[PDB]
Amino acid sequence: MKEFYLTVEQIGDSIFERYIDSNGRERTREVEYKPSLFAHCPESQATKYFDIYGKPCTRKLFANMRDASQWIKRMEDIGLEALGMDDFKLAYLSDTYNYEIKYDHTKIRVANFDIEVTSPDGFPEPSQAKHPIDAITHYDSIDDRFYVFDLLNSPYGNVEEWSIEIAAKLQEQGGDEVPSEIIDKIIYMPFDNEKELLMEYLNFWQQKTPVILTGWNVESFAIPYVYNRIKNIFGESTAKRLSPHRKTRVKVIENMYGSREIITLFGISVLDYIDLYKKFSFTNQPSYSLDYISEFELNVGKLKYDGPISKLRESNHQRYISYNIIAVYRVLQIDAKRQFINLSLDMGYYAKIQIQSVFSPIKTWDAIIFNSLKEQNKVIPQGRSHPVQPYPGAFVKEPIPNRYKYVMSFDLTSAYPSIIRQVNISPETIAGTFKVAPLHDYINAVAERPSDVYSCSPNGMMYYKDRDGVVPTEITKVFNQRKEHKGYMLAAQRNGEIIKEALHNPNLSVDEPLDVDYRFDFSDEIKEKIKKLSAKSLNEMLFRAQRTEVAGMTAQINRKALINGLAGALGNVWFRYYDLRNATAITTFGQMALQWIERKVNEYLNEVCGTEGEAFVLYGDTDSIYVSADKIIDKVGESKFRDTNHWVDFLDKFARERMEPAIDRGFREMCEYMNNKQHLMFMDREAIAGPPLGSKGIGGFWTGKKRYALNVWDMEGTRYAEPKLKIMGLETQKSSTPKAVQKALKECIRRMLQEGEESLQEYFKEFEKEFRQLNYISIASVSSANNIAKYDVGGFPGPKCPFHIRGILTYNRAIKGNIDAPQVVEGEKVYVLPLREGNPFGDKCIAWPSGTEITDLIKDDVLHWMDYTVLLEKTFIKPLEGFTSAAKLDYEKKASLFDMF
DNA sequence: TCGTCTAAGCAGTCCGCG
DNA sequence: GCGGACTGCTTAG
Ligand SMILES: Nc1nc2c(ncn2[C@H]2C[C@H](O)[C@@H](COP(=O)(O)OP(=O)(O)OP(=O)(O)O)O2)c(=O)[nH]1
Ligand SMILES: [Ca+2]
Ligand SMILES: [Ca+2]
Ligand SMILES: [Ca+2]
Ligand SMILES: [Ca+2]
Ligand SMILES: [Ca+2]
């Protein structure tokens, strides 16, 4: 097999690399890597190295990495560009792995761990590490084993050994329900003291040294706690054994309001799963506790115990250990589903970066582009300092707030990357500028043609057409990968709909789920077999189809995020290829493209319907248009359709055979007008929306920009078994909206869109009557909480104190003196409830840490004083009045002359 | 919330608006 | 009450 790196570090003048050799074995080596950098040189000097602009360069070979770094400094002192890859480990990987890396994940040691620390006096601060570590569960992916290190004797209590037999039993047997599929994979090690536990942990770690290290909050909690605790007990040298190169660094992570410390372990790649989840999941959650996320992702019940966590070990050590094991397993289950580790390895090896660098699109693109240019003996420019400057983005059309019965939407495939490719936008392809007309003049094709030579953007930039820039070349490669995975995702989705249909008629038999690849559209043979399957088999198949869809989603959406991130990186001052000329070339072209095509679509449809000045495009945002199809349906007449699926078919056909060819023609003209390199503006139909045939549903509504709802029957070629709501921006989609309120508002919208006014009025009346019985957590608003200290004046709200911060201050006063009460953590999320006039808390609201029950000390008082009236008006009635006034209907029945009887 | 970008919505504070 | 200036937070893209 081909060799591949596991980790790489620079330590002084050495590269330390862990790698898999040609025999599949893990090795480590120290290499006195001599880096090269570059300087511009005269024409007369013959060289093979050229900078991205074609200027000749001489290569400078350094005796060591420190010499190279010092040279860079002196070049700055002189005022001359020092060219080349200044991150020497990236240069090392590029030299050592000069081919497309094929990696074997089965050889990569992925460790998932979690620790427990009993603490009487509140949260155990990792930088202090003053409390014993009393449990560690460490899963090793190569062994496929959970290694459990259990402390039996502690200053906080002596306990009995954990029992695997009780752990395996049902909760209803008094057991812990540790899943049977992991029972035989547990290696349990009890210890009579913490020193021996930690010494044995370190010896184990030496034997089974993680390459990828993950878990939940491991970077901010578990790693620093373990490092600092070992440091406190044994000294620094012992703690540094967590690094295979015995080198660690405290790294200060800074943000707007403060900073925190993490421990960098040289020779390990830490990918904290909470951070992987935040970057790759495309969710915004009210809480990021593992229990909350586990419930959301896996539909598993919260890990239930009595008393505070600080007393769990002494009261129920059995459960304490079991829950530690389950916590580790839950992260593995989330990963089995989401496949974020797989994604990280894919992107990391593709770019040839340290795997942990997948968190940084700038680092990722820097490496991809460097490797690409190096292949042609081209030399990358020095990174420069730039001041942060605002620049313009997308165009968003102001919609007329209204109901919209029939809607078809269209949008560009990978819009910004396609613009980069079409225009040929790259650092080295800038050809010059032209005199810009107002955007409106390009949109309306009255401005003079920008260039007869170069490819243009309406921001005034011109680009070479003779050859692809490195940015278009590399962005295309990742786009092609994204397209492959999106294909698999969409097939799995369509396959899921076939199974849902079959589930209407499940057969009474005992059989098995079919062994199929859900990434490919089901053959006729498979479809026939599906129609004969039991509900049990069909449901298992649906689960598997949906898991395949999730895997495809992760792979496609994050590759889309990577390529969109390059468009963004061009507008970030830390990017080597920062250039506001290019960043704005993209966004300004986009503004034109949208408004150009709005004009073209309106023109096409006015012609088809034989009208003039009629607005068919009702809305658009960035790269999308929403077209009213009422007139198209009416040209046929509703009574001519057999059912809903019949008109959906008709619109699908109209979009594919009439609309899209008109759109394509419109964009081809725009490409010619801008003299672009290649036509790549592909605006395919997204949604087909409308009410059920014969219903009083309104189909859709807009309240304003980025705020709308649509009843969708077909989405990107997926024909749904049941209509699905596409809701954007409304309160149902916001993590700040109470859970039960999102639910209720979604049902109000469903009724509006599918059933009509009377149905909405029936539901509203019921919700208003019953909502006070809803659990307090389900009706609490959620907010992130920043700058709590800024607004805290002697425990009371200072000037301009935000509502949620006021709630936190109320909470802090209510729990004052308690070392044990859950503290609100700066920058994390809180639940917020309004309080009735004259409450004991002395203010109008209270807030507490999200994802948790409020502490028992005050729970009773909160429940008693919760202001249901304010809650209802603010979170439910206000948004609903917004929806209904936009859609021109009433959520309450107005009086009529019929009331006289 | 360490980690690519801008546009734009709504909640809430403070205070004007005769 | 509402709106604007402003902060804070959260979306759509
Ligand atoms: N710089 C930057 N631009 C973004 C980001 N998200 C969206 N955009 C811009 C770039 C996208 O191409 C454009 C349109 O967004 P879409 O959500 O329609 O995605 P896109 O067209 O890329 O992919 P699609 O093929 O429609 O799934 O909006 C981002 O995180 N950073
Ligand atoms: Ca725990
Ligand atoms: Ca798009
Ligand atoms: Ca599409
Ligand atoms: Ca059947
Ligand atoms: Ca779009």
Short mmCIF file of N, CA and C and ligand atoms in Angstrom, two decimals, chain A residues 411 413 486 684-685 716, ligand 4:
data_model
loop_
_atom_site.label_atom_id
_atom_site.label_comp_id
_atom_site.label_asym_id
_atom_site.label_seq_id
_atom_site.Cartn_x
_atom_site.Cartn_y
_atom_site.Cartn_z
N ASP A 411 -33.23 28.00 -8.69
CA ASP A 411 -31.99 28.62 -8.23
C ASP A 411 -30.73 28.01 -8.84
N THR A 413 -27.22 26.27 -9.39
CA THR A 413 -26.40 25.23 -8.77
C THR A 413 -25.07 25.86 -8.35
N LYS A 486 -24.16 14.58 -3.74
CA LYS A 486 -25.52 15.08 -3.78
C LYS A 486 -26.40 14.12 -4.57
N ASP A 684 -31.87 25.47 -12.10
CA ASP A 684 -32.82 24.36 -12.17
C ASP A 684 -33.98 24.58 -11.21
N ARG A 685 -35.11 23.98 -11.55
CA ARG A 685 -36.29 24.06 -10.70
C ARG A 685 -36.01 23.44 -9.33
N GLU A 716 -36.62 19.38 -5.97
CA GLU A 716 -35.45 18.93 -6.74
C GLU A 716 -35.60 17.51 -7.29
CA CA D 4 -30.75 22.67 -7.62
#
